[PDB]
Amino acid sequence: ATLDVRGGYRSGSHAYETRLKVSEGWQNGWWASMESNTWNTINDVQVEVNYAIKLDDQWTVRPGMLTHFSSNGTRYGPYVKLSWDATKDLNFGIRYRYDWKAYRQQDLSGDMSRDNVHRWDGYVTYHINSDFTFAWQTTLYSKQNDYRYANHKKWATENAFVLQYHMTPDITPYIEYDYLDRQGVYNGRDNLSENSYRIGVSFKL
Ligand SMILES: CCCCCCCCCCCC[N+](C)(C)[O-]
Ligand SMILES: CCCCCCCCCCCC[N+](C)(C)[O-]
Ligand SMILES: CCCCCCCCCCCC[N+](C)(C)[O-]
Numbered sequence: 001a002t003l004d005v006r007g008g009y010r011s012g013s014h015a016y017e018t019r020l021k022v023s024e025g026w027q028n029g030w031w032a033s034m035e036s037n038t039w040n041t042i043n044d045v046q047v048e049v050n051y052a053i054k055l056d057d058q059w060t061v062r063p064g065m066l067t068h069f070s071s072n073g074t075r076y077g078p079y080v081k082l083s084w085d086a087t088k089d090l091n092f093g094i095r096y097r098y099d100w101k102a103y104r105q106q107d108l109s110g111d112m113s114r115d116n117v118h119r120w121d122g123y124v125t126y127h128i129n130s131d132f133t134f135a136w137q138t139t140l141y142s143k144q145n146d147y148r149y150a151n152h153k154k155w156a157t158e159n160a161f162v163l164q165y166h167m168t169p170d171i172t173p174y175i176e177y178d179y180l181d182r183q184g185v186y187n188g189r190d191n192l193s194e195n196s197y198r199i200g201v202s203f204k205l
């Protein structure tokens, strides 16, 4: 199993975040994770499970679900991820997730609806050498219903860039930059450029 500890700062929202995440995978193909996230402007819990269906030596499909709890209520995210181990050192992934909210919120028409979201994620991971792995995750999400993001649009993006250092077989420090679109909100103003800078470490328990 792996414990991941991460700290970050978001420039638009002027917010620190921390994450503690524990994950395990099994030989039968199951995988599960649980995490807690904190956010402090100058909490949530998520649980995820999936299963690997091996289509051949290089291709895997993982149906799964992400459940998310916060002050507003519960959100469920059933998904299917397709992964391709193109080489020993290069992996690609694509995931569709439907983030469905178990609670209603006021929409832009004044009605109480569900702020459900269609979410797509692309993944590239490249093992550069014994010392370094570089990962990029690109994200698009769009509103199913009559809502908008803080960028004033029905859609938004995230792009995350992670450099992992394989310090020991069981310890992997990493640094990360994310651009989270103009989703920053601070001091009563939205549409702020949201740069995110993170540092963390992943280790074997
Ligand atoms: C790349 C920068 C790493 C940032 C590490 C963030 C650690 C969390 C700090 C918690 C303090 C929150 N605060 C400032 C509101 O008290
Ligand atoms: C091994 C740590 C991984 C996180 C596991 C989650 C355990 C439950 C903690 C819930 C957080 C309680 N809180 C902060 C919302 O008050
Ligand atoms: C649409 C073009 C897709 C980009 C291809 C990425 C390059 C790595 C693929 C090489 C793997 C070939 N093979 C047969 C060993 O699996």
Ligand SMILES: CCCCCCCCCCCC[N+](C)(C)[O-]
Pocket (backbone or CB within 6 Å): 082, 083, 084, 092, 093, 094
């Ligand atoms: C989840 C990644 C999606 C990959 C995009 C489509 C490129 C597929 C390449 C086919 C593989 C060719 N082959 C059998 C020689 O490895």
Ligand SMILES: CCCCCCCC
Pocket (backbone or CB within 6 Å): 009, 197
């Ligand atoms: C003056 C507040 C800036 C805090 C930025 C933190 C960078 C890691």
Ligand SMILES: CCCCCCCC
Pocket (backbone or CB within 6 Å): 011, 197
């Ligand atoms: C505006 C804050 C910038 C934080 C940079 C962190 C070190 C690259």
Ligand SMILES: CCCCCCCC
Pocket (backbone or CB within 6 Å): 055, 056, 059
């Ligand atoms: C035999 C491998 C099939 C590749 C999976 C394609 C899924 C659209």
Ligand SMILES: CCCCCCCC
Pocket (backbone or CB within 6 Å): none
């Ligand atoms: C034998 C490999 C087939 C590739 C299918 C690609 C699905 C996006």
Ligand SMILES: CCCCCCCC
Pocket (backbone or CB within 6 Å): none
């Ligand atoms: C030698 C293979 C490099 C091509 C990788 C392109 C990834 C989209």
Ligand SMILES: CCCCCCCC
Pocket (backbone or CB within 6 Å): 177, 195
């Ligand atoms: C001051 C502009 C922030 C963009 C930094 C990009 C880091 C890779």
Ligand SMILES: CCCCCCCC
Pocket (backbone or CB within 6 Å): 136, 159, 179
């Ligand atoms: C792999 C290159 C993606 C760069 C996207 C950055 C958008 C701010």
Ligand SMILES: CCCCCCCC
Pocket (backbone or CB within 6 Å): 161, 179
């Ligand atoms: C390759 C990371 C740079 C992303 C561009 C966003 C900076 C404003």
Ligand SMILES: CCCCCCCC
Pocket (backbone or CB within 6 Å): 005, 006, 007, 018, 019, 173, 199, 200, 201
């Ligand atoms: C409380 C967050 C800790 C940040 C981890 C940094 C590891 C180098």
Ligand SMILES: [Cl-]
Pocket (backbone or CB within 6 Å): 114, 116
């Ligand atoms: Cl619905």
Ligand SMILES: [Cl-]
Pocket (backbone or CB within 6 Å): 152, 153, 154, 155
């Ligand atoms: Cl729009």
